[PDB]
A paper describes a structure:
During the process of helical reconstruction, as the resolution was increased, an additional separate density became clearly visible and readily interpretable as a phospholipid. TraA folds into an all-α-helical structure, containing three α helices (α1–3). Two main species bound to the [name] were identified by daughter ion fragmentation as phosphatidylglycerol (PG) species, PG 32:1(16:0, 16:1) and PG 34:1 (16:0, 18:1). Each lipid molecule makes extensive contacts with five surrounding TraA subunits, while each TraA subunit interacts with five lipid molecules. In the lipid, only the head groups are solvent exposed and directed to the lumen of the pilus.
Conjugative pili are widespread bacterial appendages that play important roles in horizontal gene transfer, in spread of antibiotic resistance genes, and as sites of phage attachment. The pilus is a polymer of the VirB2 protein (or [name]).
Numbering used by the authors:
A (entry chain 3E), B (entry chain 3D), C (entry chain 3C), D (entry chain 3B), E (entry chain 2B), F (entry chain 2C), ...: 2 to 64
Write the structure that this text describes.
Amino acid sequence: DLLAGGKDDVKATFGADSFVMMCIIIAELIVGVAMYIRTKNLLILLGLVVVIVFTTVGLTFIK
Amino acid sequence: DLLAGGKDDVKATFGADSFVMMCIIIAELIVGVAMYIRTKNLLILLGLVVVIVFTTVGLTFIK
Amino acid sequence: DLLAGGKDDVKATFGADSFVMMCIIIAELIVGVAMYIRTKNLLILLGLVVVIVFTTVGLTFIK
Amino acid sequence: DLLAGGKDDVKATFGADSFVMMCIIIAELIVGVAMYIRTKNLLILLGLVVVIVFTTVGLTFIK
Amino acid sequence: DLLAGGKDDVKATFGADSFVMMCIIIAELIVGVAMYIRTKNLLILLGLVVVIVFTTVGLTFIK
Amino acid sequence: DLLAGGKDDVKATFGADSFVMMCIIIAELIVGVAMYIRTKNLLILLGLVVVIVFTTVGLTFIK
Amino acid sequence: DLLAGGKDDVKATFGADSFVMMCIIIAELIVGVAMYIRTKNLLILLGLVVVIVFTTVGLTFIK
Amino acid sequence: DLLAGGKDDVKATFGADSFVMMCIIIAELIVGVAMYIRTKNLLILLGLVVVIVFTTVGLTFIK
Amino acid sequence: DLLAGGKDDVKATFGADSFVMMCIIIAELIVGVAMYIRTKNLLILLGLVVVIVFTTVGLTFIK
Amino acid sequence: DLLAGGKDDVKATFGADSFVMMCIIIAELIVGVAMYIRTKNLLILLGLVVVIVFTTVGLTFIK
Amino acid sequence: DLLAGGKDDVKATFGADSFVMMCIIIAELIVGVAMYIRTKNLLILLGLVVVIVFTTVGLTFIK
Amino acid sequence: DLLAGGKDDVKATFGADSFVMMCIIIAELIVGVAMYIRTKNLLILLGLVVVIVFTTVGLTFIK
Amino acid sequence: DLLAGGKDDVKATFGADSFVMMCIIIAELIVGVAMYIRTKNLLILLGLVVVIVFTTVGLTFIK
Amino acid sequence: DLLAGGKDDVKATFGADSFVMMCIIIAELIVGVAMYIRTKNLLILLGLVVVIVFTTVGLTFIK
Amino acid sequence: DLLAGGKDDVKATFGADSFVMMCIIIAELIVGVAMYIRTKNLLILLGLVVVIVFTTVGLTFIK
Amino acid sequence: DLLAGGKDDVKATFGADSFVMMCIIIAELIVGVAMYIRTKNLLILLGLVVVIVFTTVGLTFIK
Amino acid sequence: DLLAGGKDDVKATFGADSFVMMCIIIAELIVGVAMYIRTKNLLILLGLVVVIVFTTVGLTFIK
Amino acid sequence: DLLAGGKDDVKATFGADSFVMMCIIIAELIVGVAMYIRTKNLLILLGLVVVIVFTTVGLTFIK
Amino acid sequence: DLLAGGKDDVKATFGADSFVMMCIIIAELIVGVAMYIRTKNLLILLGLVVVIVFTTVGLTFIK
Ligand SMILES: CCCCCCCCCCCCCCCC(=O)OC[C@H](COP(=O)(O)OC[C@@H](O)CO)OC(=O)CCCCCCCCCCCCCCC
Ligand SMILES: CCCCCCCCCCCCCCCC(=O)OC[C@H](COP(=O)(O)OC[C@@H](O)CO)OC(=O)CCCCCCCCCCCCCCC
Ligand SMILES: CCCCCCCCCCCCCCCC(=O)OC[C@H](COP(=O)(O)OC[C@@H](O)CO)OC(=O)CCCCCCCCCCCCCCC
Ligand SMILES: CCCCCCCCCCCCCCCC(=O)OC[C@H](COP(=O)(O)OC[C@@H](O)CO)OC(=O)CCCCCCCCCCCCCCC
Ligand SMILES: CCCCCCCCCCCCCCCC(=O)OC[C@H](COP(=O)(O)OC[C@@H](O)CO)OC(=O)CCCCCCCCCCCCCCC
Ligand SMILES: CCCCCCCCCCCCCCCC(=O)OC[C@H](COP(=O)(O)OC[C@@H](O)CO)OC(=O)CCCCCCCCCCCCCCC
Ligand SMILES: CCCCCCCCCCCCCCCC(=O)OC[C@H](COP(=O)(O)OC[C@@H](O)CO)OC(=O)CCCCCCCCCCCCCCC
Ligand SMILES: CCCCCCCCCCCCCCCC(=O)OC[C@H](COP(=O)(O)OC[C@@H](O)CO)OC(=O)CCCCCCCCCCCCCCC
Ligand SMILES: CCCCCCCCCCCCCCCC(=O)OC[C@H](COP(=O)(O)OC[C@@H](O)CO)OC(=O)CCCCCCCCCCCCCCC
Ligand SMILES: CCCCCCCCCCCCCCCC(=O)OC[C@H](COP(=O)(O)OC[C@@H](O)CO)OC(=O)CCCCCCCCCCCCCCC
Ligand SMILES: CCCCCCCCCCCCCCCC(=O)OC[C@H](COP(=O)(O)OC[C@@H](O)CO)OC(=O)CCCCCCCCCCCCCCC
Ligand SMILES: CCCCCCCCCCCCCCCC(=O)OC[C@H](COP(=O)(O)OC[C@@H](O)CO)OC(=O)CCCCCCCCCCCCCCC
Ligand SMILES: CCCCCCCCCCCCCCCC(=O)OC[C@H](COP(=O)(O)OC[C@@H](O)CO)OC(=O)CCCCCCCCCCCCCCC
């Protein structure tokens, strides 16, 4: 059988609605605008979108 | 269940009416005019508009 | 609630009647005449007008 | 309140009777005659007039 | 399904009655007259018409 | 077999009716008119058409 | 004989119909249009074609 | 005489048809397209060819 | 075999009855009359005829 | 012997009846008429003919 | 004596009838027509000829 | 006397007819045509000639 | 002695009976008639003669 | 004394009867006729003569 | 006294009759004709003369 | 008193007539002509003069 | 209370009449003329003025 | 009080009659004539005058 | 006092009777005739006179 195996709730800690998933997404926003202002090209504002989908489709592979 | 999960008020710190959202928007204005004067083309004054909408529609994805 | 949230007076520093808003407008004038003399076409003298309105209608979005 | 806000005398430096306003107007004269002699059409001598009024009505917007 | 998908109101920001659609059309007018006066041929005054229709029939392709 | 293979819905995120496909097409419009006004030649207004078809026939190759 | 030799299904992970081959092709599309709009020359829209064939004829060399 | 000398099958592990020779070639493909998209010059797609021949003519020197 | 090869409907987009073929012919009319009025010689009104036949016999070479 | 040598079908992709050979010929038509209308001299309509023959006699040198 | 000296078949890989010699010649054709259409002068169509002879008389110096 | 002094055949490895002298010359050809196509000026095709003579007159200084 | 020195057949490529010498002479004819029709003076039809002799007596200086 | 000093035969490579001196003279011919046809003035056909003498009297200064 | 001071023969290596002084002068010739053909103005053929005298009167300052 | 103070002859090593002062001046000549040929403007040939005087009036400050 | 708080005379070291304020202003002059001569546009001579006022109004904020 | 404050004689080094003020003025002369000869317009000879006055009225601000 | 202050003889190097003042005047002559022949208007032959006086009255300001 499995040991240490536990709980999982660790998943709920890092999961969909979380504190860490909430700060990791807000940093993408705030330094996304930063690296935009210093440059002014737009692929970087789109760089926020790839974090939205990545975390979303990423978290479903945890199970 | 969730841990560390907290408060959120961190959202209120970086949210709609905030100090950091107030300075990140005012820098777009002041270096927007800068890179305009050194060049004098207008897509850059419009570069302020894309920060208005980006932060606005961005903050609603935090939840 | 909000943290760091402060004062604002930072707004009064960069606001309507300010030192930085006073120098950023005077540079538009002095390099506006410059790029005019080296060329002598008039859309550039009008380039001062777009800084007048931009800062004016820009500062009202800070709030 | 305001910070950095200062003095203004910076205005007196770039203002009506100044050193920089005195040289920026004298360059209009000397390269105005230049681009006239190489061509000999008169709208360019009139190009000095638009610098007279522009700086005059421009400086009053600083305040 | 779709993510990030949002709102749209971004469309209302750049749409038919807007601030940016209002300034992008007024620049066509003011530099249209400019490039007319320096030349005096009329296809350029007609250059304003092609911006009227282009934005109009353009915005309907957004959906 | 395949791993990581997933979902696809990533396709629905960047697909036909999307948020990113909606902004990438609206930028073609707004800087299309820009580079038109500064020049006034028409192949550039047609530059919007090639983005319409390119994204359309492009997205069908994703599968 | 061979060791570690395995499975292959790793091939099916990166192969013809895949998740990674699906995202690597969609990035060519979205930054292809980007570098087009900022420039407006067409060899770049054709830059999508060379990724179609390259991955296609590339994957057949894996075996 | 020779000691430790063994088997060789280690050669079959890293040889022509292998697992490691299969992944080392597939990385050339996937980061070849990457460094292409971020740049769009073609010598890099040809960078896959030099890995094909190098491993091929390289493995024959093992003996 | 062929890749990327597609659809064609791109042909229907630029083909006989189209939007772009409709605007490219109407510009010949409107600037044809222009360059006529400023001059008043008639080979230019005939310049519309050569666009009629050119697009007609041109489109049949696409296949 | 030869390596990487492949398929060719790459030839069929860029060959006689193709998608890229179909768009590269249709651009000659549409910007041929453009540079004609802005000028109205006819060697440019003949510029379409030299693309017909060039691609035709060019493709036969690929082999 | 010589080491590493090998095979040559590397020559057959890059030689007369090859895959890389087939793509390097087809790019000359497709961007030759490109830089022609954007300009319409003919020395560039002749630019394909100098690649024909250069590779031909070049490959004979390999030995 | 001399030590380590050996053989030379290392000279035969890098000498006139060699594998490395064969690949170092073929790269000059293939990236010579590359940097030609992206530009179309001819001093670069002549850049192959200076590698022919340089290696030739260079190798004779080894002794 | 000489290096790179080759073949010549490059001479036969650009020589008397050639493909490039055949197209360079036919362009003189077709744009000779063009610039004649738009003007109707005859020194230009004679402009074809000077290309006949120039290439003829020119090619003999190659050796 | 002198080092590296060599051979000269490098002189024979670029000298009187050479491959590079043969192509550098044939380009003068072929783009000489080009820039003639697009213009039809004759000093340019004479531009071939100045290359004949220049290379001739130039090569004698090498020694 | 002096150290390292040597020989000079380094002077004879780069001096009047040398290998490097022979190639540095022949490059002036071959790219002199190049930049002439692409332009056809004559100050550039005279650009060879200034290299003749410069190296001549330059080398005498070495001592 | 002074220690380590020595000899000077180090001065004679780097002084007026030296080996290092002889090579540092000859490099100015040889890369002076280089950067001239690639450009053909003359301030650079004069760049040799400023090294003549600089070393001359420089060495007298050593004492 | 305050510690380390000292003297100030550090202010007198970097203050109005100082050694460092005297060299920092003289460098603006000497490299101001430099970047002027290499270019010859005049906003740079005015670059000395902005250092005059900046240090002046800057030093008053130290207190 | 002040420290490091010194001497000034640094002023006498860069002052009115100096070595560096003597070379910085002579470069304006020699590259002034250069950029004149390559162009032949006269505002540039006047560019020497603005260095005369600038250094003169500049040095008086050092104190 | 002054440092670095030297000699002047640098003045004698660039002064009235000099090598550099001798070549800078002879270039005015030789490219003066050039730009005359290609045009045949006479203000340019007079362009030599303005170099005579400019260097003459210029050198007297060095002191
Ligand atoms: C778990 C699945 C992982 C799949 C990830 C796929 C990555 C494959 C890489 C493709 C080519 C690399 C392009 C280099 C990047 C490149 O060349 O562009 C560079 C660009 C930012 O520009 P830079 O500031 O780096 O400056 C470079 C510029 O000069 C070039 O325009 O990258 C971005 O961040 C913009 C993103 C927009 C592009 C969107 C593509 C769609 C992405 C979707 C994948 C979502 C992941 C979900 C997974 C959970
Ligand atoms: C979260 C959603 C993210 C979506 C972001 C969409 C980005 C897709 C990129 C499209 C093509 C890139 C064009 C390159 C940019 C380009 O070529 O123009 C360049 C231009 C500035 O010009 P530069 O100084 O860089 O000089 C280049 C010039 O020579 C070209 O005119 O960019 C700007 O900053 C002007 C912005 C006006 C254009 C407005 C477009 C509408 C934007 C709306 C999106 C709002 C985001 C909201 C998200 C919260
Ligand atoms: C916050 C709101 C942002 C909205 C900004 C709107 C920008 C949209 C761009 C429209 C087309 C771009 C034209 C390119 C510019 C162009 O083609 O002209 C070029 C012209 C200067 O000429 P250049 O020296 O660049 O040389 C180019 C010339 O050859 C063309 O005549 O631009 C100027 O600086 C003159 C401005 C007069 C035009 C006034 C327009 C009215 C503006 C009002 C917006 C005020 C902003 C307030 C926001 C706070
Ligand atoms: C702060 C307020 C800014 C408002 C500025 C107004 C600019 C609007 C542009 C109007 C049409 C542009 C005409 C192009 C210019 C054009 O086509 O003429 C060109 C002409 C010089 O000729 P060029 O050497 O460029 O050669 C072109 C010739 O072939 C055409 O005759 O421009 C001048 O410098 C002459 C100025 C006389 C014209 C006086 C007009 C009255 C001006 C008053 C504004 C004073 C500003 C005060 C602000 C402080
Ligand atoms: C989304 C759909 C895009 C379709 C765009 C169609 C563009 C096809 C180009 C046709 C030939 C190009 C002519 C070159 C232009 C040319 O030769 O004229 C040049 C002329 C301006 O003259 P310039 O100052 O450039 O000087 C050139 C003069 O010497 C020639 O008279 O262009 C204009 O801006 C005037 C526009 C009047 C012509 C109106 C035509 C009707 C247009 C309707 C399309 C509306 C677009 C709606 C889309 C939303
Ligand atoms: C996926 C399939 C990819 C195929 C792409 C085909 C590209 C082949 C390039 C042909 C010659 C290049 C011409 C250079 C461009 C050139 O010379 O014109 C230049 C012109 C813009 O003018 P510029 O501002 O660059 O100034 C240059 C001017 O002086 C020349 O008139 O380009 C445009 O953006 C106008 C587009 C109208 C032309 C429409 C052509 C039809 C296109 C259809 C393809 C749709 C793609 C769908 C794929 C999803
Ligand atoms: C795809 C096939 C391409 C074939 C194109 C044939 C072009 C050969 C050029 C012949 C001589 C050039 C004459 C210069 C032009 C010239 O000298 O006239 C000049 C004239 C316009 O006059 P401009 O305003 O340029 O001022 C010049 C005047 O002073 C001279 O009268 O050109 C026109 O646009 C009028 C067209 C009427 C002439 C009709 C001819 C029949 C054309 C039929 C071809 C249809 C093409 C179909 C292809 C799809
Ligand atoms: C692979 C084989 C390559 C051979 C290519 C041959 C190119 C040799 C250049 C000859 C002289 C250059 C003339 C400059 C061009 C010149 O002076 O005319 C200029 C003319 C266009 O006029 P522009 O708008 O450039 O304005 C210039 C005018 O003022 C002069 O009338 O060029 C064209 O595009 C018209 C083409 C009609 C001429 C047809 C000639 C027959 C061509 C056949 C070759 C087919 C290639 C097949 C290869 C696959
Ligand atoms: C291995 C042997 C290497 C020998 C290479 C010889 C190169 C010597 C350079 C001569 C003068 C340079 C002219 C600059 C180029 C120049 O001024 O023309 C420029 C022209 C293209 O025009 P662009 O678009 O650069 O615009 C410039 C125009 O405004 C000038 O018309 O160059 C071409 O690509 C056309 C080629 C036709 C000319 C054919 C010449 C015959 C070539 C034969 C050599 C074959 C090589 C075989 C080797 C394997
Ligand atoms: C062992 C002996 C070493 C001696 C080497 C001699 C190098 C001296 C440098 C002379 C001036 C530098 C010119 C810069 C280069 C320059 O300005 O041209 C630049 C040109 C390539 O053009 P780029 O693409 O760099 O673009 C620059 C262009 O805009 C200028 O046309 O250089 C080449 O690769 C073409 C070579 C043709 C020139 C042939 C010269 C004859 C060479 C013979 C030496 C053979 C070596 C044998 C040794 C084994
Ligand atoms: C390799 C040897 C090079 C030698 C080339 C000799 C060129 C010397 C220039 C003489 C005076 C220039 C006259 C300007 C030209 C001039 O004033 O006429 C202009 C005339 C064309 O008229 P346009 O359209 O330029 O309009 C100008 C008219 O208004 C004047 O009637 O030129 C031609 O193309 C006609 C040619 C007939 C003249 C035939 C002369 C015999 C030529 C024989 C040389 C054959 C070369 C063989 C070499 C391989
Ligand atoms: C090594 C020795 C170097 C000495 C080179 C001498 C160059 C001195 C420049 C004199 C005045 C410049 C004239 C500008 C050129 C100018 O104004 O004419 C321009 C003319 C070509 O006309 P474009 O197409 O540039 O258009 C300009 C026209 O509108 C003017 O008619 O130049 C040529 O290529 C024709 C050459 C015939 C002239 C032959 C002259 C005899 C040359 C003999 C030297 C042989 C060199 C041998 C050295 C190895
Ligand atoms: C060691 C001694 C150094 C003294 C060097 C003297 C350089 C002083 C610069 C004078 C004014 C600069 C003119 C810019 C150059 C300029 O405006 O012309 C430009 C011209 C080449 O024309 P570009 O292709 O750069 O195009 C520009 C054209 O549009 C202008 O006609 O320069 C040359 O290479 C031609 C050389 C003929 C001129 C001969 C002059 C006599 C030179 C004698 C010096 C020999 C040096 C021996 C030293 C060992």
